[PDB]
Design a protein around this ligand. Sequence first.
Ligand SMILES: Nc1ncnc2c1ncn2[C@@H]1O[C@H](COP(=O)(O)OP(=O)(O)OP(=O)(O)O)[C@@H](O)[C@H]1O
Ligand SMILES: Nc1ncnc2c1ncn2[C@@H]1O[C@H](COP(=O)(O)OP(=O)(O)OP(=O)(O)O)[C@@H](O)[C@H]1O
Ligand SMILES: COc1ccc(N2C(=O)CS[C@H]2c2cccc(Br)c2)c(OC)c1
Ligand SMILES: [Ca+2]
Ligand SMILES: [Ca+2]
Lengths: 281, 167, 137, 341, 400, 236, 174
Amino acid sequence: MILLEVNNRIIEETLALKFENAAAGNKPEAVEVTFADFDGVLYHISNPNGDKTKVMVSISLKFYKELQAHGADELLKRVYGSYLVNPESGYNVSLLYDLENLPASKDSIVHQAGMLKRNCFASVFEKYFQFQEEGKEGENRAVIHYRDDETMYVESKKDRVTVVFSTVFKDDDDVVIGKVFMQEFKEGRRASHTAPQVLFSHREPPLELKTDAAVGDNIGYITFVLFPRHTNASARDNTINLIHTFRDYLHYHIKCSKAYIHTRMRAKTSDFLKVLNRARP
Amino acid sequence: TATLRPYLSAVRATLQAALCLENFSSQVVERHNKPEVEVRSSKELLLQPVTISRNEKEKVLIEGSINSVRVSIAVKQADEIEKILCHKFMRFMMMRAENFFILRRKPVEGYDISFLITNFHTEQMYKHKLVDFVIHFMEEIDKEISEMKLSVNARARIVAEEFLKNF
Amino acid sequence: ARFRKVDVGEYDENKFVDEEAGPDEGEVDSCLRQGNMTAALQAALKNPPINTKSQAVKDRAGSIVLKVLISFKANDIEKAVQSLDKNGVDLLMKYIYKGFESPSDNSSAVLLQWHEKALAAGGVGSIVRVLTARKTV
Amino acid sequence: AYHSFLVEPISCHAWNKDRTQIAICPNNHEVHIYEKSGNKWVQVHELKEHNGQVTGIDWAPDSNRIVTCGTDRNAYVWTLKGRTWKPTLVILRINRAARCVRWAPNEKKFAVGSGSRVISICYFEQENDWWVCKHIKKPIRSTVLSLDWHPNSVLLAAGSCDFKCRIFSAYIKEVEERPAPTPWGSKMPFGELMFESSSSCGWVHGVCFSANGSRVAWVSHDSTVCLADADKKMAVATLASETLPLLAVTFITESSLVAAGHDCFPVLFTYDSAAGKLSFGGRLDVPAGLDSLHKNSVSQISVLSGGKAKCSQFCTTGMDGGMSIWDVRSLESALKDLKIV
Amino acid sequence: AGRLPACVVDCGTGYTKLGYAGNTEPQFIIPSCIAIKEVMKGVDDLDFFIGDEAIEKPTYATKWPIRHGIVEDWDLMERFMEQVIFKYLRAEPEDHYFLLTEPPLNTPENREYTAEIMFESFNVPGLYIAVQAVLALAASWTSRQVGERTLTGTVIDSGDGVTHVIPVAEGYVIGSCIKHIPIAGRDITYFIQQLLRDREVGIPPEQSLETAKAVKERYSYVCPDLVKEFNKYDTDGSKWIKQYTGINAISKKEFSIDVGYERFLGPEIFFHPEFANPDFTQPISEVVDEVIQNCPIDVRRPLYKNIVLSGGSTMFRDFGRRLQRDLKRTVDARLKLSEELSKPKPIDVQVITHHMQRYAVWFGGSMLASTPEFYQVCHTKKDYEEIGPSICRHNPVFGV
Amino acid sequence: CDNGTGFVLLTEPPMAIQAVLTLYAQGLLTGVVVDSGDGVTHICPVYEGFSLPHLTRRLDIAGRDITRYLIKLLLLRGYAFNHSADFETVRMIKEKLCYVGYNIEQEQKLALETTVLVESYTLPDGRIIKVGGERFEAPEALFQPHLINVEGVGVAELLFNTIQAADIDTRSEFYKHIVLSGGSTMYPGLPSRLERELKQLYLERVLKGDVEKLSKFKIRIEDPPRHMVFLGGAVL
Amino acid sequence: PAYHSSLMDPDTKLIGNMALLPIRSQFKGPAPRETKDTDIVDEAIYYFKANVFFKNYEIKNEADRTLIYITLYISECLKKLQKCNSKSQGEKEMYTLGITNFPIPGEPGFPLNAIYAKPANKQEDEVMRAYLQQLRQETGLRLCEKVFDPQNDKPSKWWTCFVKRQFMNKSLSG
Ligand SMILES: Nc1ncnc2c1ncn2[C@@H]1O[C@H](COP(=O)(O)OP(=O)(O)OP(=O)(O)O)[C@@H](O)[C@H]1O
Ligand SMILES: Nc1ncnc2c1ncn2[C@@H]1O[C@H](COP(=O)(O)OP(=O)(O)OP(=O)(O)O)[C@@H](O)[C@H]1O
Ligand SMILES: COc1ccc(N2C(=O)CS[C@H]2c2cccc(Br)c2)c(OC)c1
Ligand SMILES: [Ca+2]
Ligand SMILES: [Ca+2]
């Protein structure tokens, strides 16, 4: 697995199992599940008031207000319609599924539910991909703190939309392994000339932040420049699916890089021990 | 290189002169037996420490004693990525010092990796083969460190391409 | 446990105790300019500071011998080394190791060349005497 | 003639009177005795008493008694009663490991060098029925590595880690008397330091007196071999080697030495009485991964026959568990360039 | 606990249980396998699948890294964790403390190797390596037979590899008294497969094991007596012989067969191994009694009064009953001979069967990793940094 | 017959006196005996001929304690030992591998920086474990009671005070005649550790610090090769 | 463990070290006449399907030896019964199989020779041979009514399925 998936498997398999049972005519089993997603997201699936014919899926995001300020509620309403209900205390969005009244193609809503998190993010991108297209310049850029110490800035310009990430590297060495990775992103167009352009700065914040930017030997700034062919209505969704997984994509690969090195070290260390024990009579 | 063969040659001759050990019961503590180069409690049992340098970065420290020899190696680290790869690798091996019975758990200050070869090792193993192992080890860690570097870079490119080409 | 901090061994009466100027600057410099190397080496390997506690005077001799080894020409090393007697090779071997302790420019490149030649004449035993010495350069 | 007794080290050995049996220490707490039967070796005894590694080992020829010392700080005299060896404990009064031991030629005494920087001369008092001992302390300042008795059973050569070869008087008038004057001195009261080498570096691994006692030779860790001639004011001839340190040495004639060490092979040294100089006589072992017979350091050598005045065969044991028998005669014919004495 | 629940992983010989602490059931239960491709250049190391997706991969070879016997492939395990974390649990590894279960009698070295992967590769903020038996005991506190916490008891863990009889005193396993039994869920399935081959026809060849495993989980149970059972079956075959169906992959058709004696014969091998194993013949009840008898005298009764089950292979109906009875017979019989040889106060044998049994370990692990205690005792990233992996050698006990 | 709290005309427990039978076998009438077995450790000063009930002290730490401590120590390293079940097993490990550290700081460096102390020991069930630093950590209890949570000063400092509370005309005779007795006094290096410990104390609480006057401090701890008590009876 | 005979009596007779148990049968032989509702042949058939799985059997009474013999012989009947096509054809071949001179204790081919005593003389020989044959004809007769599903030409698969198992891994044919 190279790219990270966008949908939550726990949500999908929990709903899928319940629907399969509702349609089969079996009495409903109770459900209580607490789980998470990347970026400090917390989910909760349960039976409101103990009614087993009802399955609620709730997601909690510390930075939800920021997404709300950018059309989050309106977008979620479009996608989930009647399944959207008042949020469960402690969460920002709640989906409710009546096991006694399910749609013909259940497998369809099961997948939209698995995308709850990605759909909470969708609006911020649709708003600016929309500005850019209507040539509406000068619009204030959005600031989304997807993590306690990381930020995402989105700004629309005449012919492009910029998505900047202020990410952090914990292990001081991880900064180096990261510089290597960003370097290949920097030169990416040598592999795909139509792909978005990626800029990278270390310690110094980009111009697109002209705003409480964080200076630090472990802060990394990755700028993605998205063009109309990436932001228009036809590519928009896939673009959002990629761009929103970027930060976790980078760290995921840094860690998998270290895993691959551990195997190299196991092979070499092992080779040595063979040569050493061969020194015995 | 033009300077590797001569370096290793000097290191090898030095290790052969230093790996001349015998079993030595403690002279300071009733019925103990300790690697003299580590405890250093009998000045007369310690040999003169000697160094072999290739340049001002790459070198080896060889400390003899009547029953043991400590060997420290300053590994070649050309850049940053190389510095962290070397540190991770030396650490990886040291965590496994027990299986690598001639390795030291921590390096002498100033070096990247240290060996502690004792009379027990030279009793159970051909000392000329232990000499070979040290030289072999020195050459192989540079190659490994290079492969790791290429490995990281190569995987980094494919990773950037995979993500970018999906837009 | 205040008492376990004083190393009484330090004042032990068994603690073994070891049995307690340099080359002529102008002489070697002459030989060097004067014409040929071999004599310069011999003058440089003369009267080593084996008995002075002064790290300065020892480092003094070291610098001299070193300067000579660098001034040499890669192909004149063997000839010179072979002019030395066993005791000479032994002392040369000691200066070469002291050299390894002060890398600067490519002095090590040349020192490794001398080590190869000194080793050929004195054998591994000359290295053994570098380690064995209780009084050294 | 090489034989493997084990893949581990033979810490030390000792042969009985007619070289019919050999006692070796298999790098542990015991002593195994092997006997020759035809062209094979057969293990016949096992001496398990030491509670630490056996370091020293000697065999008094006539009285047929074996003496052993180990890192457990003890010495045991073994006497053969019937078909088994029985150990009698000797209290050395040392608080550190014993490192070596040798019976005097007269078989009434035995010396033990130890990490207590002392030499323990032991003898038997048939009155109170047991072994006692006097200590030779001064001026030893470190572990005594090797010992060798002078033919008069009074003078003792000793090598220690304080880099010295010394000759002491071991005179024990309780079992012998006034030693006849010797070229090393006329006054030999117990413990008298008769001689001390001058070198200030190199642990002295082996020491050896010549057949007539007028010469003593020692090998040090600084890869040198030395010989002191009492018939020449105790002058010392020195020879620095090009190879690794020797660990064992012995005369094979009054002017020839055979040593062996970390190079894993026996070599020859000759002494020019007139010139008062020593020379390298050459490699005796002529062609794992080694061209030598032993595959690890040789730590002991002993004369099998012909004594030290005209040795015809000698023995070497090493860390490889090997035991080799060398024939001087055969060596001379295989190496026509070999010149003994 | 902080904002996010900890991650709990129980990797078994045949199945791995994954989820977040606090939950009663694992969120994922997948086969303990991984399918790889076989000088790895590029990024080939990432081309692998695990669980169900790794079972029948056309161009990939399936591998089972976890199994009593062979040395462990750390490359395989490390890779395995990558997907467990980023593909299934979807947890930012740096934001969650992790609890992993170790196999019985695991070496301390293996603990350091696990800590190296978790801290060095995944950078977790905390790790806890748990002993299965302790989690099993804890899981049982959920029973109505036992209403008072205790970490002293005999754990019988039967899953897919080998069944273990592990004695625990005040929370610490008496490792020198552990004994295992060459019979488990896989052995039983194989046995039912042989009985079906002898009788039923039509079972798809490449589905032989599959059908057996199914018959085992749906229709098996432990009867109180063989002849009587057999008789019930031959007397009124109508209320005992069942029917089983399946679809044959190559024809996508349904094939049916009669399910019979195998129902009770399969689980019987726990009590009569000689039925399917030529090399082992000791009945489970005797192994248990043998194990307890080897423990300190003064702890024998506590062990007899709290024999706890764990694992999918203990799920057969009446497994606990059968075991308790047979163990009482052996114990009562022995006490008799001693009295008849001259007054040992009767020994109370009690096997606990509870609802959270199938995943006893994971459940125990989930509950423990949901308590404030867990976060205090657990080793942190800073501890690993300042002291090294050796800290993970000892994992403090708690719960009582 | 010598009776023992753990193993077996008749020896008698401190407070024929066993302390005197020990010194007796050494051909001694005066001197301080340090006897450490399986249950308790005593310090019995004997003056010209016979014991002195007074001044004799005791240490609530010995064999059994060291064995117990070794079990806790091996548990902290990941080995699943049971205090009651494996007691005999760990005792054998203790007897084969444990010893007394001369310089603790130095021993910790060897264990922490190298693998020279690491020894393998095969358990009765066939498993192989590894014991290193705990080889010298367990016996250290004898010098630092608190390690096993026992109040006191440690055999060494305890031995010091015993002889200090004695006449000044005997202090020398006693000091130069300290003899060990008991299975728990056979840990390699024990004699050396005591001597170093005693000199330290002496230089601090007697010589107050006058280092130069230390060299003339007559310290000889007799550690004879042989269960001296039994030996004593025998001869007599 | 396995299932043992409970018909042993303080007055049960012996032929070799086997127990000469009574049987309710009309076939000829030295078997005592049986009056009780069930006998040794009935006991063996009731225990068969269970006993046949066991590998180890501890011989307690001489009754167990007779029990074991019948158990092994039942197996023989299944091998032959299996290939039959009617309760009738089955009964026919049960007689034909009952008449075959199988090996007896002491003979090569008879397993368990270390457990069964050999006939001491020519009389014990003939009587033992006669008792074993009688047991066979009778056992074989009863199995038929047990093996063929009330719907003839159908040797129940619930009996046929045991055709390959061997009590104590032994065989009267091997
Ligand atoms: N109801 C059931 N009755 C009998 N067996 C069952 C039942 N349910 C599951 N099993 C069996 O449980 C086994 C798996 O058990 P589980 O996963 O708990 O053990 P494991 O952890 O994988 O193996 P181990 O703990 O020995 O390493 C499989 O053989 C499965 O067929
Ligand atoms: N070589 C040894 N090194 C350390 N401890 C040992 C050694 N041998 C025995 N011990 C321990 O010493 C104790 C036994 O000592 P001894 O044999 O002196 O006891 P005892 O005389 O029976 O009892 P006491 O001496 O307490 O009356 C036990 O703990 C035993 O394990
Ligand atoms: C056979 O490969 C294994 C080797 C070791 C272990 N583990 C441990 O030794 C410590 S906890 C467990 C484990 C479980 C999951 C991932 C990792 Br990494 C390690 C393991 O999990 C039982 C499997
Ligand atoms: Ca399990
Ligand atoms: Ca006692």
